[PDB]
Design a binder for this molecule. Structure first.
Ligand code: SF4
Lengths: 277, 280
C-alpha cells in the first residue's frame, strides 16, 4: 500500500511458457515509449526472466541471490536495480535455493529490501510485478494474499492448462477481494492461433465476469526482437505488433473496471474446452 | 515413518520439469511392469500441474485427495473415492493442488500420502510404487518428499533442452542436500529424447559429471502421441511396438537398479561448457 504512491501498481499473473514475460516487458516499454510514463518492473518468476529484454541480454543479479551471497548490509540499489530501455527500472526477486525456502518468502524479502533501499521512486507512473501462476500455493499467490498490487491481470492462451491456470488465479483473486482489496482488471490473450480463439476468450471472460483487455497476436517479429535481446517496441516501434502492445498498454493504463471475478467450476471449464475443440 | 509404505515394493520418486513427458514415461513404465512382468503397481500423483494417472484410467479424471479433503472433510476421503484401478490393475491416486493462497503444494503431497497411509491404501503386496513429483522449481515444499524419505530411490527425467538439464541439476541439488539426513539417493537419469539425434552422448556426459548413470534413453516416437490421443499408454495401445520394449527395458532397469549415489551437481560454468560443446 505504501509503495510508489501515485503509481498504478499492477501484477501480471499467468502460467509459464506462454509468453507472459514478453507481454509484460513489451507492455512496459510501450508505456514508456508511446506515453512517456516512468515505469518499473519487479520480476517474481523463479526463472528471473522478466527484465532481460529491457536490459538487453545481460541476466540481472537477483535480490535473493545477492542476499544469499552477501547479506543485508552489503546489498545496494546499484546492484539489484538496473536501468534499461527508456529508463525502465528493473529488479528481479530470484528463486529459492534448491531444496529449501518458499518462492513467496523470496518475493516478500525482495520487496522488503527494495522498500528499505527506497528503490521504488516516488514519481513512478507504472510499477509491474511479473508473477508466476502455474500453482496458486501460499508462495506464488502471496501477492494475492497480501495485495502486493490491487490491480491484477491474467495472461492466458487458447490452451487447456493456460485456461486452467487463469481460472485458478481468479479464485485467488475472488478469495482475497475483501481482505486485501485485490481485483481483476482483465485478461490478456497471448494467441496460440487456434480457430475461434478470440471467441473462446470473449466467452471465458464473460463467464469470469471480466473482460479481454487485449488479444495479443502471434507475430514472428517477437522472436526476431528477442534474438536481439530487445523488446518489439525498441526493435521496431513502427511495426504492427508494436501498435498491438501499445493498445494493450493504453487499455491497462485507462482501465477502471476492476471486478471480483466469478471463476468457473471444473464442469463449465470442461464444456468450454470441449466446445472450442 | 514413511518406510512403512509398501515394504515389499521398490518405492520410487520421479522428479522432472514439466512439458517433457515425465508423466507419460512414469505411466508407461508402470504399464510395462504390470503388463510384461505381472507386477502389482501403483502410481501416486504428486504434480499439481500434471495429470499422472489419466493414461491408466482411460481419460477418466480422478478426484484428488486434497480436493476431497478440503471441500468434503476428513471423513469423506475414502479409498473408494481417491484410489482408482486402471490398466492391468494399476492403482491410482492424485495428491491434488493447494488451497489458493494458503496451502503449500508440497506439504499437500505429504498430507495426501499421510491420508493414504491412514486409509491403508498402500497394499502390502505392492511390487512397485511411483510418486510422480513436480520438479519445475525445487522449493522446500517439493523437496519435502526428499527430506521426509517418501522414497529413498529418486529418478530424474530430463531431455535435450537447456532448461530440462538445468532443472535436472537443481533436483540433483535437492537430493544431495538431504541425502545424509534422509538417506535419499539418485538412482539414475531418464532421458525423454526430444528428437532422433545425438542426445544420448550429451546425456552420457551429463550423468558422468553428476556422478550417476543414464537408466534409459527413451527415444522419440510418434506412437506416444497416438496412444495419448486414445487416452492410453503405449503398452495398452500397442504392446508389440519398439517403444513398448523401450519402456519395458526402462521398467526392468528401475526395478532391479541397486546403484544409488549422492549426486555431484554441476557448477554454472560446467553447465555452460556442456551447452557450448553440444550446441545451444
Ligand atoms: S507454498 Fe509453494 S513456493 Fe512455497 S514452499 Fe510450498 S510449494 Fe513451494
Amino acid at each position: 500500500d505504501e509503495i510508489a504512491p501515485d503509481a498504478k501498481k499492477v501484477a501480471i499473473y499467468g502460467k509459464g511458457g506462454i509468453g507472459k514475460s514478453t507481454t509484460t516487458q513489451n507492455t512496459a516499454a510501450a508505456l514508456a515509449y508511446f506515453f512517456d510514463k516512468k515505469v518499473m518492473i519487479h520480476g517474481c518468476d523463479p526463472k528471473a526472466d522478466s527484465t532481460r529484454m529491457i536490459l538487453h541480454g545481460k541476466p540481472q543479479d537477483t535480490v535473493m541471490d545477492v542476499l544469499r551471497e552477501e547479506g543485508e548490509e552489503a546489498v545496494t540499489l546499484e546492484k539489484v536495480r538496473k536501468i534499461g530501455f527508456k529508463d525502465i527500472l528493473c529488479v528481479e526477486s530470484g528463486g529459492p535455493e534448491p531444496g529449501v525456502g518458499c518462492a513467496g518468502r523470496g518475493v516478500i524479502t525482495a520487496v522488503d529490501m527494495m522498500r528499505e533501499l527506497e528503490g521504488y521512486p516516488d514519481d513512478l507512473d507504472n510499477l509491474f510485478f511479473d508473477v508466476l501462476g502455474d500453482v496458486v500455493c501460499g508462495g506464488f499467490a502471496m501477492p494475492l494474499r497480501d495485495g502486493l498490487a490491487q490491480e491484477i491481470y491474467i495472461v492466458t492462451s487458447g490452451e487447456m492448462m493456460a485456461l486452467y491456470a487463469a481460472n485458478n488465479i481468479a479464485k485467488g483473486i475472488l478469495k482475497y477481494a475483501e481482505q486485501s482489496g485485490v481485483r481483476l482488471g482483465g485478461i490478456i490473450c497471448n494467441a496460440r492461433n487456434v480457430d475461434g480463439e478470440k471467441e473462446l476468450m470473449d466467452e471465458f471472460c464473460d463467464k469470469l465476469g471480466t473482460k479481454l483487455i487485449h488479444y495479443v497476436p502471434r507475430d514472428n517479429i517477437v522472436q526476431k526482437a528477442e534474438f536481439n535481446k530487445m523488446t518489439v517496441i525498441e526493435f521496431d516501434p513502427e511495426c504492427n505488433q508494436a501498435k498491438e502492445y501499445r493498445t494493450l498498454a493504453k487499455n491497462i493504463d485507462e482501465n477502471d473496471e476492476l471486478v471480483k471475478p466469478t471463476p468457473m467450476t471444473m464442469d463449465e471449464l470442461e464444456e468450454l474446452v470441449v466446445k472450442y475443440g
